[PDB]
Write an enzyme that holds these catalytic residues in place. Structure first.
Site, PDB file in Angstrom:
ATOM      1  CB  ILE A  28      -0.958  -0.076   1.501  1.00 24.95           C
ATOM      2  CG1 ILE A  28      -2.037  -1.208   1.104  1.00 24.95           C
ATOM      3  CG2 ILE A  28      -2.020   1.889   1.348  1.00 24.95           C
ATOM      4  CD1 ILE A  28      -2.580  -0.933   2.217  1.00 24.95           C
ATOM      5  N   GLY A  29       1.911   1.486   1.332  1.00 29.93           N
ATOM      6  CA  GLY A  29       2.754   2.591   1.302  1.00 29.93           C
ATOM      7  C   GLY A  29       3.421   2.868   1.917  1.00 29.93           C
ATOM      8  CD  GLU A  30       7.610   6.176   5.276  1.00 26.61           C
ATOM      9  OE1 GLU A  30       6.797   7.025   4.637  1.00 26.61           O
ATOM     10  OE2 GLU A  30       9.243   6.008   5.732  1.00 26.61           O
ATOM     11  N   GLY A  31       4.372   4.347   5.321  1.00 21.54           N
ATOM     12  CA  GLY A  31       3.787   4.920   6.737  1.00 21.54           C
ATOM     13  C   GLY A  31       4.734   5.995   7.516  1.00 21.54           C
TER      14      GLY A  31
ATOM     15  CB  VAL B 133       0.991   0.576   5.147  1.00 16.06           C
ATOM     16  CG1 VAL B 133       0.106   0.340   5.617  1.00 16.06           C
ATOM     17  CG2 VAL B 133       1.537   1.459   6.219  1.00 16.06           C
TER      18      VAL B 133
ATOM     19  CG  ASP C  22      -0.723  15.277  12.423  1.00 16.00           C
ATOM     20  OD1 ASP C  22      -0.435  16.318  11.704  1.00 16.00           O
ATOM     21  OD2 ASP C  22       0.361  14.588  11.877  1.00 16.00           O
TER      22      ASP C  22
ATOM     23  CE  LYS D 299       3.546   3.130  10.366  1.00 16.38           C
ATOM     24  NZ  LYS D 299       2.654   4.393  10.558  1.00 16.38           N
TER      25      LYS D 299
END
Length: 340
Positions: free
Chosen positions: A21-24, A29, A139, A44
């Site tokens: 899915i990607g970096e976290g 992830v 955040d 993750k």
């Protein structure tokens, strides 16, 4: 161990059929199939143990998400790590797979007023629980609001969260800050450490504005540009509001600025629901003391179709300098309940 983009992603045997899915933050992830619950989930990988800072944020996230139980706050389903501190170099956090998030949604999809209303309701409903626990998220932004295929919305990423501490909120002018720039309240740049609930409400205001036009309302390119974005819309702060800023560097900065008049919300957002703009105004108030609180926001006419305080639960159980090594033991202990 299963591999993904050549990096060990070792979540078996319960979790199979991984997709990237990607970096976290300090790792990767992936989605995967949960062979016990028969659903795809998000996992993750976190590798924080070399840095004080990563350990702090990882412990914060885990402690907070395991204590919290709320429909509008992402849960931790499971945590995978080694059976021993010595062998533990990574932790895998398992959550319900959320198809998308409000960031991805806003870059491609026009939101109906009905969606905007439902999304804002769910955001404030989760924030009411968070605040009831004496926690600040600190955040909030579109990418930290997850959504599934039926538009259930869940707040995630508590890595920058703090326990509320309004008596220790005051600081000097241009004090550095960690949370994402476009969603930072004006006072962060002037005299605030971000230790009161009003910091989060500002961020929600910014997200509401973004939901109405698909563009961030205050896209600052750097620390002080962010204040100048805010004042270009809200206009110059009132004498009364300046009088609440005792710090001289901060007050004199604002006095140095040319007078700017308010940009009316109904001109920025000509197709917006008028109740939505009334609530936006009360969330994007310059003076933190005058800014609407979460429960007041839930009670606003805009949200009257959803508002039901009996179905907006609060937390049962309200809530650095530790070295790497002790934080690692804390993370080990905090994750023990998921071990067989």
């Amino acid at each position: 161990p299963e591999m993904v983009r050549g990096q060990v992603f070792d979540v078996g045997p319960r979790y199979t059929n991984l997709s990237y899915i990607g970096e976290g933050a300090y790792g990767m992830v992936c989605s995967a199939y949960d062979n016990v619950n028969k659903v795809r989930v998000a996992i993750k990988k976190i590798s924080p143990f070399e840095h004080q800072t990563y350990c702090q944020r990882t412990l914060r996230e885990i402690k907070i998400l395991l204590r919290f139980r709320h429909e509008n706050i992402i849960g931790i389903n499971d945590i995978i790590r080694a059976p021993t501190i010595e062998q533990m170099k990574d932790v895998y956090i398992v959550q319900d797979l959320m198809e998308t998030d409000l960031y991805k949604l806003l870059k491609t999809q026009h939101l109906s007023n009905d969606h905007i209303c439902y999304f804002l309701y769910q955001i404030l409903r989760g924030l009411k629980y968070i605040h009831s626990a004496n926690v600040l998220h600190r955040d909030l932004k579109p990418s930290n609001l997850l959504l599934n295929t039926t538009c259930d919305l869940k707040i995630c990423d508590f890595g920058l969260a703090r326990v509320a501490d309004p008596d220790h909120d005051h600081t000097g002018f241009l004090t550095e800050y960690v949370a994402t720039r476009w969603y930072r309240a004006p006072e962060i740049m002037l005299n605030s450490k971000g230790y009161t609930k009003s910091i989060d409400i500002w961020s929600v205001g910014c997200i509401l504005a973004e939901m109405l036009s698909n563009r961030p309302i205050f896209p600052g390119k750097h620390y002080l540009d962010q204040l100048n974005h805010i004042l270009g819309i809200l206009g110059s702060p009132s004498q009364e509001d300046l009088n609440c800023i005792i710090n001289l560097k901060a007050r004199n900065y604002l006095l140095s600025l040319p007078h700017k008049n308010k940009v009316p919300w109904n001109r920025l957002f000509p197709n917006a629901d008028s109740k939505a703009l009334d609530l936006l105004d009360k969330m994007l108030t310059f003076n933190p003391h005058k800014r609407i609180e979460v429960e007041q926001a839930l009670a606003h006419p805009y949200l009257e179709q959803y508002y039901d305080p009996s179905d907006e639960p609060i937390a049962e159980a309200p809530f650095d300098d530790l070295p790497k090594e002790k934080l690692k033991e804390l993370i080990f202990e905090e994750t023990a309940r998921f071990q067989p």
